[PDB]
Write a protein that binds this ligand. Structure first.
Ligand code: HEM
Ligand code: HEM
Ligand SMILES: CCS(=O)(=O)N1CCC2(CC[C@@H]([C@H]3c4ccccc4-c4cncn43)[C@H]2O)CC1
Ligand SMILES: CCS(=O)(=O)N1CCC2(CC[C@@H]([C@H]3c4ccccc4-c4cncn43)[C@H]2O)CC1
Lengths: 375, 376
């Protein structure tokens, strides 16, 4: 098994198992706002409500799940506060009574004070029926921004893809064991199981079309997920009033912050973070938005010997095909994902009364993946 | 420390006993690198580079031959791009050098530009193998121009690196001491770290004896500069035959030194935390370190915090030992600010950026100073 210090679950992987839904009564004022964001944003009540909050101590968030729930709560409120109704009117200062505890909590959890993938995908879910499986029909999100924002469809499909990819994480100890022990057959089997899970993860992705509408995604949800790093709207970042004097820049959410896909790039020696380029820089930076235990797990994988070099050295057609099957699965995922971006970003952007830079980043990452094929 | 991190007992992150000569196959590269001052001064460097045939990197069969080739190709690239360093600039690196350089850079997981690991850590030799690592028993392998003080700059940098790196071997003692709750051992370890970082500063004092401000500013500064955020090459460098579009890569920085980054990490200074530019920059420079050295840094980040261990213990002895380490880093950076004033700011004022560079350095110094438990 993988060590407990990396906080990787057997079933959900890097996802938070059975996320907490309710905070202690002490934090009811936070909970009320986060639970009613759609109506409070729409009616222009959200900002005054956040401004009228009292500064609450984080000390009564006594465990990890409560701290992670609070991060999800405060992060959603923070996006609602900064972006407002999502029409380009921006708050440049986050008031101290929310900014201070959010920054304190974020420092405690070693995550930046902005909504991350680990909040809004990995900790933002529940089973409707605990006795039924982790499927879309038996799941809901904990928080959404606006009515019709398609956040359920986006967050849950993202979660399910993550969970399907994560079924191969438990094979990783076997891989490195098989290399050190020079176990060709064990390694071959292990690589075939990884390809199977990454192939399965692609089929899970196909659901996105059923539960997310392009127009709503582009015009609404995209807005609330965006951040303030290299964002012309918040040129210098956001002022977290009372914590830092200067405005601070933090990137909005990205599945670049997903540890599973970074994990298999590392495992397969794809070297996405190597070389000093723009795309590498971004994906390396995104590791700071991951929970520290998961950050550490990626670092650990990078310190182990290369699977790619092991397979490359061996003159073993069986191993090369199994290796290549893992790489092909990552390329196919990334290729399908590009087609998603065309449908959900490029086309809606063209229809409104940038895209190329986003596509080029994704194509760089895909190409680096394809270029790791041995055959 | 595991041998997979490629940290030497004597020279730490430096490459022990660097290779001086490449295989005969690469003589054409070696000639240009060995005669850069002569070729630049005669206006023959660019022609010589352009006359090169594309040589395969497959005959560079070990890590040291590859690190030497990187240093050679890196120095040739700086000379080719910058020329005589008067503003006559090349935006296209010819394919016959660009291809092998990028191929080799990919193999070693480094950006295709001269980095600290090339021009400091791999750019040296002992004169007498039987004598210690001192300035007078050492030389650099490559310089750019005559009188550029590259020996002084690169070797003093290396000596400071090595002095500081004597503390690296203590790091596993620190974590073992913590995990095992060995207070006296941890205290002794932290005092040794402080001693070495204090020694590094004394070694730094030698810079004044071997580098002249004018030569440094007007000559060497040029050849060390890169093409990331540089108006001279706004869109970066075209590496002909490897990539179609120009690529931006940062010039050398001792932010690329793994020793100072590792002690920041060890002492919980957290230079790469938060939403500021200094953090981003120091984070980016890790990409310009050799991969095993990158790995080592992140592995230190995964161990428990020394700072939070010391903060928890109500132990004046431990706190003082901890602060002596932090103070040693503060003293180095404060001294380094004076060095920037002498070697950059003053020459710049005398000529017929500086604020930005000093603001960056002050932010990093401040982050260090603010990790002190007690006022220094
Ligand atoms: C409406 C659906 C989606 C759209 C429009 C979309 C769009 C984008 C865009 C524009 C980027 C580049 C900017 C950034 O990093 O934030 C990106 C990155 C990324 N996305 Fe998505 N995405 C969607 C859903 C998903 C899903 C379900 C996955 C799960 C596989 C995913 C995986 C990734 C990964 C791993 C990256 C980082 C680059 C890479 O590793 O290839 N995305 N996405
Ligand atoms: C002529 C001598 C030197 C001058 C003019 C100089 C100047 C500078 C400048 C302008 C920077 C900021 C830009 C950059 O990162 O490249 C810098 C960074 C840095 N320098 Fe130097 N430097 C000199 C020598 C040294 C030496 C010998 C050391 C060894 C201690 C050193 C250590 C550092 C470190 C560690 C950084 C990154 C910021 C930090 O960690 O504080 N420098 N230097
Ligand atoms: C860059 C400003 S932008 O306005 O052009 N812009 C880019 C497109 C997105 C769409 C989803 C979002 C990101 C994310 C946030 C949270 C949870 C999962 C995922 C995810 C999965 N793939 C990508 N993302 C981000 O890439 C929104 C913001
Ligand atoms: C920004 C373009 S600039 O022209 O203003 N400019 C900044 C000042 C420097 C001075 C040395 C150099 C860097 C370095 C390169 C190789 C080996 C060790 C070290 C080193 C140590 N401290 C700093 N550096 C860089 O920071 C030159 C270029």
């Amino acid at each position: 098994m993988i060590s407990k210090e990396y906080h990787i679950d057997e079933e959900v992987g890097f996802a938070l198992p059975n996320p907490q839904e309710n905070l202690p009564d002490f934090y009811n004022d936070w909970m009320f706002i986060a639970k009613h964001l759609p109506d409070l944003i729409e009616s222009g009540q959200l900002r005054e409500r956040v401004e009228k909050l009292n500064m609450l101590s984080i000390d009564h968030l006594t465990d990890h799940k409560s701290q992670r729930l609070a991060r999800l709560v405060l992060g959603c409120i923070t996006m609602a506060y900064v972006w407002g109704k999502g029409h380009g009117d921006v708050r440049k200062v986050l008031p101290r009574n929310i900014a201070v505890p959010y920054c304190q909590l974020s420092k405690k959890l070693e995550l930046p004070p902005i909504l991350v993938y680990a909040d809004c995908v990995l900790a933002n879910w529940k089973k409707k029926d605990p006795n039924k499986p982790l499927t879309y029909e038996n799941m809901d999100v904990l928080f959404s921004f606006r009515d019709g924002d398609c956040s359920k469809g986006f967050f849950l499909v993202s979660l399910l893809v993550e969970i399907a990819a994560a079924s191969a994480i438990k094979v990783i100890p076997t891989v490195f064991k098989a290399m050190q022990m020079q176990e060709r057959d064990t390694l071959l089997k292990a690589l075939l199981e990884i390809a199977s899970c990454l192939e399965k993860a692609l089929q899970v992705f196909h659901q996105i079309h059923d539960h997310v509408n392009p127009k709503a995604f582009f015009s609404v949800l995209r807005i609330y997920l965006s951040g303030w790093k290299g964002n012309p709207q918040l040129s210098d970042g956001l002022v977290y009033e009372g914590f830092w004097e200067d405005p601070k820049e933090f990137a909005g959410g990205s599945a670049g912050q997903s540890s599973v896909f970074q994990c298999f790039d590392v495992l397969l020696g794809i070297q996405q973070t190597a070389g000093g380029g723009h795309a590498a820089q971004f994906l390396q930076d995104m590791r700071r938005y991951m929970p520290p235990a998961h950050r550490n797990f990626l670092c650990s994988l990078e310190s182990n010997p290369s699977v790619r070099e092991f397979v490359l050295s061996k003159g073993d057609a069986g191993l090369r095909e199994a290796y290549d099957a893992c790489v092909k699965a990552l390329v196919s995922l990334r290729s399908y994902h590009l087609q998603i971006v065309t449908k959900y970003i490029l086309i809606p952007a063209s229809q409104q009364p940038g895209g190329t830079d986003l596509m080029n980043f994704l194509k760089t990452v895909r190409s680096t993946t394809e270029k790791s094929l041995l055959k």
